[PDB]
Coordinates of C-alpha atoms in Angstrom, one line a residue:
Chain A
X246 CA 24.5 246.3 -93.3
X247 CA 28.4 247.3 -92.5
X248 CA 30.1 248.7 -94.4
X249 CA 34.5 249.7 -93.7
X250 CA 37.0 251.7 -95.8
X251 CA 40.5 251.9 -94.6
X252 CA 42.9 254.1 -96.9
X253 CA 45.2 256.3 -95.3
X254 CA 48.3 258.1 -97.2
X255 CA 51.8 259.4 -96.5
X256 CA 53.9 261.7 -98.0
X257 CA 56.3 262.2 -95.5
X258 CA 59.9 261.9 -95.7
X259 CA 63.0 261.1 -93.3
X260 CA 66.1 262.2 -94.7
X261 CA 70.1 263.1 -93.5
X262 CA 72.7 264.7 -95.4
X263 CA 76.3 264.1 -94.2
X264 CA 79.5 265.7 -95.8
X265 CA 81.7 262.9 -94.5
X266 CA 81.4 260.5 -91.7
X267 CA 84.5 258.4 -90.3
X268 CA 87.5 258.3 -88.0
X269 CA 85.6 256.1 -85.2
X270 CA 87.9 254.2 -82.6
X271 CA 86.3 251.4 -80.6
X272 CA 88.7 249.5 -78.5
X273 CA 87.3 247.8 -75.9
X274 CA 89.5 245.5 -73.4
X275 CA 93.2 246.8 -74.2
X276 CA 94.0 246.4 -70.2
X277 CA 94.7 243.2 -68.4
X278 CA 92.4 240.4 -67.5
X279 CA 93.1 238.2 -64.8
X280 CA 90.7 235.5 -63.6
X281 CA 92.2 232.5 -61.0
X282 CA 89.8 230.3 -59.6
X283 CA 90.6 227.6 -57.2
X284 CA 88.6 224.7 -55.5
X285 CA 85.6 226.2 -56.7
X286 CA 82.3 223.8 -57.1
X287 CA 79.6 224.0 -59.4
X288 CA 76.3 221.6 -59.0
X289 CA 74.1 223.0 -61.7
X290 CA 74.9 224.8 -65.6
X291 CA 77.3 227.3 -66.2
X292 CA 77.7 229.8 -68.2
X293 CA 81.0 231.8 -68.7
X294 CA 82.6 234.5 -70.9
X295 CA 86.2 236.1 -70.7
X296 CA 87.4 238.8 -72.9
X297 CA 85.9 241.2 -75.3
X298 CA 82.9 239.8 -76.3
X299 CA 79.8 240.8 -78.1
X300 CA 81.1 244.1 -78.5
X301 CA 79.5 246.5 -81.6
X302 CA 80.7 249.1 -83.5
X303 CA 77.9 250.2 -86.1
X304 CA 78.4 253.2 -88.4
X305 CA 75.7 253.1 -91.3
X306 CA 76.2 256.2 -93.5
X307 CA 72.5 257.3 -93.1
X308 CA 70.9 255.1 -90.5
X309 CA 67.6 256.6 -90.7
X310 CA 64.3 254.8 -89.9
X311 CA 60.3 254.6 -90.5
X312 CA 58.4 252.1 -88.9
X313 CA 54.6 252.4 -90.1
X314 CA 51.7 249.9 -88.4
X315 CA 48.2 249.7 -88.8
X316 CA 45.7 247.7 -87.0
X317 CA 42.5 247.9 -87.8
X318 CA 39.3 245.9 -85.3
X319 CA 36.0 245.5 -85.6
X320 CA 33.0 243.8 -83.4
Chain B
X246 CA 23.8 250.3 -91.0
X247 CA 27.6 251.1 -90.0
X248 CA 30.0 253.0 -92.0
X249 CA 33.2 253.7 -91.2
X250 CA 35.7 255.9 -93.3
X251 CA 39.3 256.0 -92.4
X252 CA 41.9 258.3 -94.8
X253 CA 44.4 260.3 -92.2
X254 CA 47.3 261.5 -93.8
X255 CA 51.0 262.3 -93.5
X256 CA 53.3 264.9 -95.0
X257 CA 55.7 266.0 -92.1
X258 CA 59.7 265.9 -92.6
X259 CA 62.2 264.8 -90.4
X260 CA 65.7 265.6 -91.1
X261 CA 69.0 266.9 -90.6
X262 CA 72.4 268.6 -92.4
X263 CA 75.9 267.6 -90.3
X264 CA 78.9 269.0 -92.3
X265 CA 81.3 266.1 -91.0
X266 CA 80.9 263.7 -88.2
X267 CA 83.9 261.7 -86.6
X268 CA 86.8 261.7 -84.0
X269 CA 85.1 259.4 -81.8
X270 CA 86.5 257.1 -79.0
X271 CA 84.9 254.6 -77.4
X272 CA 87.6 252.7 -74.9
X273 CA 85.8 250.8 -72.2
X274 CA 87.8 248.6 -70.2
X275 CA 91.2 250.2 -70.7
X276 CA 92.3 249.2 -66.9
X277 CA 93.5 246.1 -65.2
X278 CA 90.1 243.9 -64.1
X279 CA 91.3 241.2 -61.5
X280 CA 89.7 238.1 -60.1
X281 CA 90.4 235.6 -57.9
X282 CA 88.1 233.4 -56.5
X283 CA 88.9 230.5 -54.1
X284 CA 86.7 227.5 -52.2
X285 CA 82.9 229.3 -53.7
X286 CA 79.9 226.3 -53.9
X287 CA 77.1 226.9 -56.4
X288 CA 73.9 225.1 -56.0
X289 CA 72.1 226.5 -59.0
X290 CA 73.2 227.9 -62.2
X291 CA 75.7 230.0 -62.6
X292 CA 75.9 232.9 -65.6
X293 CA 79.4 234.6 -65.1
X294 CA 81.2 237.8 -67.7
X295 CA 84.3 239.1 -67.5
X296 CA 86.2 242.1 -69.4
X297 CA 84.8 243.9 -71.2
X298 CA 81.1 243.0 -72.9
X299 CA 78.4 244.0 -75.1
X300 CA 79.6 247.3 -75.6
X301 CA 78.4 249.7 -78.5
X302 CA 79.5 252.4 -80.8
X303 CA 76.6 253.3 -82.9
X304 CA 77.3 256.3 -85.1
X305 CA 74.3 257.0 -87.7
X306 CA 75.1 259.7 -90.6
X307 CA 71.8 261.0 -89.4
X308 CA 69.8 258.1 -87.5
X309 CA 66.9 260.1 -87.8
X310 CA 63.6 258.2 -87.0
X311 CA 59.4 258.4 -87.5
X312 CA 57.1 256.3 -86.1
X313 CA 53.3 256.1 -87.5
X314 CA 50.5 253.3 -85.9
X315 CA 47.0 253.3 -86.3
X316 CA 44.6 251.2 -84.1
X317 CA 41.2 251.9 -85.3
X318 CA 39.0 250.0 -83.0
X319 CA 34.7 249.8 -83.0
X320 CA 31.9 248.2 -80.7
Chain C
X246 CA 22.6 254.0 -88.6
X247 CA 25.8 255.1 -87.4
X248 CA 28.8 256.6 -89.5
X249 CA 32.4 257.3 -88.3
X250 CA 35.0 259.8 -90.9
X251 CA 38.1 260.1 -89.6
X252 CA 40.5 262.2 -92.2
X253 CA 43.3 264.4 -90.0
X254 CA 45.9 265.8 -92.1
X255 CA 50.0 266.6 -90.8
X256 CA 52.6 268.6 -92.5
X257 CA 55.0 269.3 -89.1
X258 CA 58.3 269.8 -89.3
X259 CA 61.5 268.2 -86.9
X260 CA 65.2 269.7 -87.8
X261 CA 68.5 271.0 -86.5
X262 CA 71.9 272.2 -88.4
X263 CA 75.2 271.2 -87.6
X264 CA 78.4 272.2 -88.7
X265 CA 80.8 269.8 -87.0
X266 CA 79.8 266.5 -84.7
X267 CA 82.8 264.6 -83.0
X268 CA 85.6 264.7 -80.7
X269 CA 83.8 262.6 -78.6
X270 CA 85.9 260.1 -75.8
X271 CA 83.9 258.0 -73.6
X272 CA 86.8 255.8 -71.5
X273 CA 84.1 254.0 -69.1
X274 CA 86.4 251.4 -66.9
X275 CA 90.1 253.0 -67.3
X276 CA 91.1 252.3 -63.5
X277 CA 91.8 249.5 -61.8
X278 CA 89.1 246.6 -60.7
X279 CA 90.1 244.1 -58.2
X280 CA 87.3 241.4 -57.0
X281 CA 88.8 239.2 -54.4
X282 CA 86.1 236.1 -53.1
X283 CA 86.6 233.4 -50.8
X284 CA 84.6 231.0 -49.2
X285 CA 81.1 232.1 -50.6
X286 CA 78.1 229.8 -50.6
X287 CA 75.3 230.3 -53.1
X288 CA 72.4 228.1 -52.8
X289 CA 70.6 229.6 -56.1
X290 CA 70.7 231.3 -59.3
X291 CA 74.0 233.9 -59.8
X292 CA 74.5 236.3 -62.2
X293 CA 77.8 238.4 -62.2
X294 CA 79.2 240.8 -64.6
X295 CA 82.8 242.2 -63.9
X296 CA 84.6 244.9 -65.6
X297 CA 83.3 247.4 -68.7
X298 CA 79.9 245.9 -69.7
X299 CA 77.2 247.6 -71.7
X300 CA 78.5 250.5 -72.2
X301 CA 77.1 252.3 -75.1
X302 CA 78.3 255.8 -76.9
X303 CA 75.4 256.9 -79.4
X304 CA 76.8 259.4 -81.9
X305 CA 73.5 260.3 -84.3
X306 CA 74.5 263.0 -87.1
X307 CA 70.8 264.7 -86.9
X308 CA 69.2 262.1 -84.2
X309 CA 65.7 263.5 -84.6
X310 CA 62.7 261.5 -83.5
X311 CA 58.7 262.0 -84.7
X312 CA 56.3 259.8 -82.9
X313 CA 52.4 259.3 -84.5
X314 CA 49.6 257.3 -83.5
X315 CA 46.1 257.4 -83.9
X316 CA 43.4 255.1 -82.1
X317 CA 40.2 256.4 -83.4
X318 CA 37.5 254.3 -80.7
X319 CA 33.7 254.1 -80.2
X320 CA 31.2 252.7 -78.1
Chain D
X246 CA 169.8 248.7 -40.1
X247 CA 165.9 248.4 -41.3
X248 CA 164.0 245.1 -40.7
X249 CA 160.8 244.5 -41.4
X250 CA 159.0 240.6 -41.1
X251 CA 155.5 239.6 -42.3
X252 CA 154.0 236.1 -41.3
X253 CA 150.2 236.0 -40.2
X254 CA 148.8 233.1 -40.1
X255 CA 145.0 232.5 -41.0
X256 CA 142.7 228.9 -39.8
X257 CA 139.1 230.6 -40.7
X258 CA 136.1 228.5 -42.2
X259 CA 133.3 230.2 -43.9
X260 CA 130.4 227.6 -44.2
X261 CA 126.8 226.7 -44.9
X262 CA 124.7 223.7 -45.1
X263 CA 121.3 224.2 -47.3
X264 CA 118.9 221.2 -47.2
X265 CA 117.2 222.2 -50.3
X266 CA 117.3 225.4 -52.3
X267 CA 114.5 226.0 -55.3
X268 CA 111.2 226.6 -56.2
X269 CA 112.5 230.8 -57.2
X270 CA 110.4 232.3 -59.9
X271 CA 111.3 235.5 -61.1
X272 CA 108.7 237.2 -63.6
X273 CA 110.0 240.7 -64.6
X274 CA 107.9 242.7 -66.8
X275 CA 105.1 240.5 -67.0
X276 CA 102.7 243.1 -67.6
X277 CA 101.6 245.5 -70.8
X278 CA 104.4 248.2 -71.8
X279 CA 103.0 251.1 -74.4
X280 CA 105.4 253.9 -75.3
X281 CA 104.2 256.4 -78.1
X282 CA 106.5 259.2 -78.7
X283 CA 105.6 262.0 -81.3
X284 CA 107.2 265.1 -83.2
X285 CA 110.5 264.7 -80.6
X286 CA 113.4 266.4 -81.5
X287 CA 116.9 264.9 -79.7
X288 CA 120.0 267.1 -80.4
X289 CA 123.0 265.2 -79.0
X290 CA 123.2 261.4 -78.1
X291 CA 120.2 259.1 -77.3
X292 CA 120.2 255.7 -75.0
X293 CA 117.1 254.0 -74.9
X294 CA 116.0 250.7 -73.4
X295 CA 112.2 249.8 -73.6
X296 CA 110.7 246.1 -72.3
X297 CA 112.8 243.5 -69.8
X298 CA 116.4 244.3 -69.9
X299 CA 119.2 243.3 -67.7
X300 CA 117.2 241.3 -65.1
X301 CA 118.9 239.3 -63.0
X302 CA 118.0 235.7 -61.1
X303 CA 121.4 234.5 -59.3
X304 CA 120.6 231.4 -57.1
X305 CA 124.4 229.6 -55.8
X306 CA 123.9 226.4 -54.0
X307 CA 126.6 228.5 -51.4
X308 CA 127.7 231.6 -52.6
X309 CA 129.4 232.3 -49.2
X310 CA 133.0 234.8 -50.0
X311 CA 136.1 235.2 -48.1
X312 CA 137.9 238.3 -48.8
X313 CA 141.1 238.7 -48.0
X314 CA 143.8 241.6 -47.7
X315 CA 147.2 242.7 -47.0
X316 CA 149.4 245.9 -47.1
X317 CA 152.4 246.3 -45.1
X318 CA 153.6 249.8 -45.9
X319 CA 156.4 251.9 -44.8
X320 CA 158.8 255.2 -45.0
Chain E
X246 CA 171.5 247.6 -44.6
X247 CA 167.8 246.6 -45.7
X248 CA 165.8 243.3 -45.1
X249 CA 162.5 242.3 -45.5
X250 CA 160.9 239.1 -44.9
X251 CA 157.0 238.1 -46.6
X252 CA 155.7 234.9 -46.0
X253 CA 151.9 234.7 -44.5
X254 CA 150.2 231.2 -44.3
X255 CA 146.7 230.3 -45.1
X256 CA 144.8 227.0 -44.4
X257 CA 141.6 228.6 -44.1
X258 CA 138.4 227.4 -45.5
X259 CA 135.2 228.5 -47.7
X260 CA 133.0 225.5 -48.6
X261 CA 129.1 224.4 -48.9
X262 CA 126.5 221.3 -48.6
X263 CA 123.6 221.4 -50.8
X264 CA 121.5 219.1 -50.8
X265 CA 119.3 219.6 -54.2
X266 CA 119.4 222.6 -55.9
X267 CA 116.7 223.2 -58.9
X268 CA 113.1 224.2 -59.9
X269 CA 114.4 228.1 -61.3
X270 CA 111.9 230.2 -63.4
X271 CA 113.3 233.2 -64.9
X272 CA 110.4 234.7 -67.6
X273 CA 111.6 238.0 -68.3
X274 CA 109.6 240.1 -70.8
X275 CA 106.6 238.1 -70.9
X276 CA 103.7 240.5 -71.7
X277 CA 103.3 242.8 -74.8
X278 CA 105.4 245.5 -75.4
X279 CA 105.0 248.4 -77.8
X280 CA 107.0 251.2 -79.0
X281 CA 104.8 253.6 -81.4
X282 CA 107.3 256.3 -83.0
X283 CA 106.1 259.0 -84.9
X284 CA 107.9 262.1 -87.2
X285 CA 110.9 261.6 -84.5
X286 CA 114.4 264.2 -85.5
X287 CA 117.8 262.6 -84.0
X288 CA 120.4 264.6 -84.6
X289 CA 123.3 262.7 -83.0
X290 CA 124.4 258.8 -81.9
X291 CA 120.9 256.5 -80.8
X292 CA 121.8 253.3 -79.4
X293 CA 118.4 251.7 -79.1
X294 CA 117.3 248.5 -76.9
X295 CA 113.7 247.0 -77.5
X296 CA 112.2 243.4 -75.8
X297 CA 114.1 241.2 -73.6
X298 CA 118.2 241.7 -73.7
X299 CA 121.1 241.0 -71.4
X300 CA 118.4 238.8 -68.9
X301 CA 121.1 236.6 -66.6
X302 CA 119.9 233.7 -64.9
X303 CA 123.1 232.1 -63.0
X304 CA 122.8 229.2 -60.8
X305 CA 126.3 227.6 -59.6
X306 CA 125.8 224.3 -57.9
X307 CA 128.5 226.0 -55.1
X308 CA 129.3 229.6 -56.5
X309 CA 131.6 229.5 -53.3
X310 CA 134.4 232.9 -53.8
X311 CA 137.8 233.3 -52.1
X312 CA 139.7 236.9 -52.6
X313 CA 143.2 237.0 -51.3
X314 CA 145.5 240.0 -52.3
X315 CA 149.2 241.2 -51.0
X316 CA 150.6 244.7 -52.1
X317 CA 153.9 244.8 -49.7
X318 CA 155.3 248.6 -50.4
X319 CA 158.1 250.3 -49.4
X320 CA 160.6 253.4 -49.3
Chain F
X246 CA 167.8 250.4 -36.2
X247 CA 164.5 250.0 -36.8
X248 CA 162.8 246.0 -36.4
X249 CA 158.9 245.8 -37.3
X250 CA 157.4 242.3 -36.7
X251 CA 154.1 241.4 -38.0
X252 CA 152.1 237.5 -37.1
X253 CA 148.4 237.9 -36.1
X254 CA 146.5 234.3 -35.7
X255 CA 143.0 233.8 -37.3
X256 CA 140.7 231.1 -36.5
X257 CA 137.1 232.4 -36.4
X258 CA 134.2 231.0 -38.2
X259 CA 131.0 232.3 -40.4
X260 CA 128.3 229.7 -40.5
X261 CA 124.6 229.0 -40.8
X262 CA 122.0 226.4 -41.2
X263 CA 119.3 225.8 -43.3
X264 CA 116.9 223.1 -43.8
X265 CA 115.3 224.4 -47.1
X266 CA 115.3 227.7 -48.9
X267 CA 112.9 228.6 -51.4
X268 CA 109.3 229.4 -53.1
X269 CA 110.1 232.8 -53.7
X270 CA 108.5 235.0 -56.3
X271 CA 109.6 238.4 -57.5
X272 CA 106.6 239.7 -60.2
X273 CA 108.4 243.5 -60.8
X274 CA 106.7 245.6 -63.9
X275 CA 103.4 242.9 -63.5
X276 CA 100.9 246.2 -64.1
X277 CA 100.2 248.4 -66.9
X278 CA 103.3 250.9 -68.2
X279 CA 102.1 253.4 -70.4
X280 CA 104.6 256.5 -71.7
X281 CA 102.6 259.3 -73.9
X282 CA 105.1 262.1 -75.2
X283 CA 104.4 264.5 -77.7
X284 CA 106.3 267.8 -79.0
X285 CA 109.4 266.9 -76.7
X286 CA 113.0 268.8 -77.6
X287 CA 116.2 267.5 -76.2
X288 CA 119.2 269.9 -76.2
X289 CA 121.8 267.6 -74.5
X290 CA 122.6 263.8 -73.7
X291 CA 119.0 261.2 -72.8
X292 CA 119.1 258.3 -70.8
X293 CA 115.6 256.5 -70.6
X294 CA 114.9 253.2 -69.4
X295 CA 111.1 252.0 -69.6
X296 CA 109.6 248.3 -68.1
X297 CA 111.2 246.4 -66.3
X298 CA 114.8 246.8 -65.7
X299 CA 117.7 246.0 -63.8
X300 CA 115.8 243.6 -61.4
X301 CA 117.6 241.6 -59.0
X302 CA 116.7 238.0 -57.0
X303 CA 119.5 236.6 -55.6
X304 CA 119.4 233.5 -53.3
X305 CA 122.2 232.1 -52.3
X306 CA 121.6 229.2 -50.3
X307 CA 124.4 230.4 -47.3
X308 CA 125.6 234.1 -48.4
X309 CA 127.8 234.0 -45.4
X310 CA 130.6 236.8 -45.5
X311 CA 134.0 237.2 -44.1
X312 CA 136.3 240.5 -45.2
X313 CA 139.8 240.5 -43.5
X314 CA 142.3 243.2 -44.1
X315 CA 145.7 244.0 -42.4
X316 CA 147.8 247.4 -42.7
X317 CA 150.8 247.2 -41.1
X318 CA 152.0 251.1 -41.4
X319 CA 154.8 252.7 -40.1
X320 CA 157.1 256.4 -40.2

C-alpha cells in the first residue's frame, strides 16, 4: 500500500509599523521634448511613444508581502 | 508499503519600526531630449520611446517580504 | 517498506530600527540629450529608447526579505 | 561791415531695389522659463520683467535714411 | 552794418523698389512661463511685468526716412 | 569787413541690389531658463529682466545710409 500525509503549519508573521509616510514628488518629463522627422520610410509595423508615459508612483502604507507555495509529487 | 509524513513548520518574524518616511524626489528627465531624424528606411518593424518612460517611485511603509515553497518529491 | 517524516521547525528573526527614512533625490536625465540621424538604413527589427527610461527609486520603510524552501527528495 | 551767405546745393540719391523680401520668422522665448523666488526681502524700488518682452521684428520693404545737417556759426 | 543770406537747395533723393514684401512670423512668448513667489517682503514701489508685453512687429511697405535740420547761429 | 561765402555741390549716390532677401530665423531664449532664489535681501534699487528680452531682427530690404553735415565756423 501508499500511504501520504501533507500538513504543514505557519505561525509566522510580516508586519511594519510607520509613524507617518508622505511628501513624495514624482515628476518625470518637466524638460523639453523635441522629435522632427523628415522623409523617413517605414515598410513593416511601428510602434511609437512620446512623452511621459507608463510612468508609476506607488506608495501603499504597509506594502508588505507573503507568498506561500506547495507542490507536492509522487511516482 | 510507502508512508510519507510531511508537517514542517513556521514561526519566524519579519518586521520593521520607521518613525516617518518621506521627502522623496524622483525627477527623471528634467533636461531638454532632442531628435531629429532625416531620410532613415526601415525594413522590419520598428518599436521607438521617447521622454521619459516607465519610470517608478515605489515607497512601501515597510515592504517587508517572506517567501515559503515546498516541493516534496518521491521515486 | 519504506517511511519518510519530515517535521523541521523555524522561529528566526529578520529586523532593523529606524528613526527617520527620506530626503532622498534621484534626478536621473537632468542634462541635455541631443540624437541627430541621417541617412540610416535598417534592414531588420529596431528598438530605440531615448531620454529618462526605467528609472526606478525604491524607498521601502523596513525592506526586509526571508526566503524558505524545502524540497525533501528520495530515490 | 559783416556778411555772411549760405547756399549749398544737394543732387544725392539713396536707393535700393529688393526683388523679394520675406519668409523672416522670429521666435523669441520659445522655450520653458521657471522663476521661484523665496523669503526675499526688497527695501527700495523693484522692476521686474519675466517671459517675452520688448522683442522686436522690423522688416521695411527700403528702410534706406538720409540724414542731413547744417550749422553755420560765428563770433 | 550786418547781413546774412540762408537759402540752401535740395533736389536730392531717398526712394525703393520692392517687389513683394510678406510671409512675417513674429511668435514671441511661445513656451510656458512660470513665476512661483513665496513669503516675499517689498518695502517700496514694484512695477511688475509677466508674459508677453510691448512685442513690435513693424513692417513698412517702404519705411524710406529723410532727416534734414538747419540751426544758423550767430553773435 | 569781414565776407564768409558758403556753396558746396552734392551729387553722390548710395545704392544696392538685391534679387531676394529672406528665410531668416532668429530662435533667442529656445532652451530651458530656470531662476532659484531663496533668503535674498535687497537694500537699494533691483532691475531684473528674465527670458527673452529686448531681441532684435531687423531686415530692411536696402538699409542703405547717407549722413551729411556742414559747419561753417568762423572767429
Amino acid at each position: 500500500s501508499v500511504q501520504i500525509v501533507y500538513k504543514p503549519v505557519d505561525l509566522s508573521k510580516v508586519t511594519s509599523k510607520c509613524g507617518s509616510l508622505g511628501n513624495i514628488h514624482h515628476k518625470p518629463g518637466g524638460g523639453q521634448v523635441e522629435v522632427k522627422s523628415e522623409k523617413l520610410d517605414f515598410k513593416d509595423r511601428v510602434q511609437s511613444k512620446i512623452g511621459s508615459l507608463d510612468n508609476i508612483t506607488h506608495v501603499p502604507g504597509g506594502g508588505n508581502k507573503k507568498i506561500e507555495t506547495h507542490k507536492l509529487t509522487f511516482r
